[PDB]
Design a protein around this ligand. Structure first.
Ligand code: NA
Length: 129
């Protein structure tokens, strides 16, 4: 599924991401835009052999099991394919564990390089939330 901007904002708000660990909703929408272009089916391989999955590009090195990242962890206790679903619940619940691990949203390279320090509230402007 490719989400609309306000559609994703509403769904992230319903799942409790608005101001989760102090990150306003615009941060999460900005992150998803530059990680996946709002596409739940996005995948990208990393140099170390791990792969990033889904709308928030969650990495198989630490967070999910994809059967092909030997010596990795599965801290969200899910198969990585669950992160590709049109239902974003698994992505959001895993994202909550990531952002709580000490580094905040700096865990997402695209957020730090393209969202941090900008007017992220612009990403939810015009949405009925
Ligand atoms: Na893994």
């Amino acid at each position: 599924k490719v989400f609309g901007r306000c559609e994703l904002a509403a769904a992230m708000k319903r799942h409790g991401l608005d101001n989760y660990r102090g990150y306003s909703l615009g941060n999460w929408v900005c992150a998803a835009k530059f990680e996946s272009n709002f596409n739940t089916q996005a995948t990208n391989r990393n140099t170390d052999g791990s792969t990033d999955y889904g709308i928030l590009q969650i990495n198989s090195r630490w967070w999910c099991n994809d059967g092909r990242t030997p010596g990795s962890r599965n801290l969200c206790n899910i198969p990585c394919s669950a992160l590709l679903s049109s239902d974003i619940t698994a992505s959001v619940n895993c994202a909550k564990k990531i952002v709580s691990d000490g580094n905040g949203m700096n865990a997402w390279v695209a957020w730090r390089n393209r969202c941090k320090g900008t007017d992220v509230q612009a990403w939810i402007r015009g949405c009925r939330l």
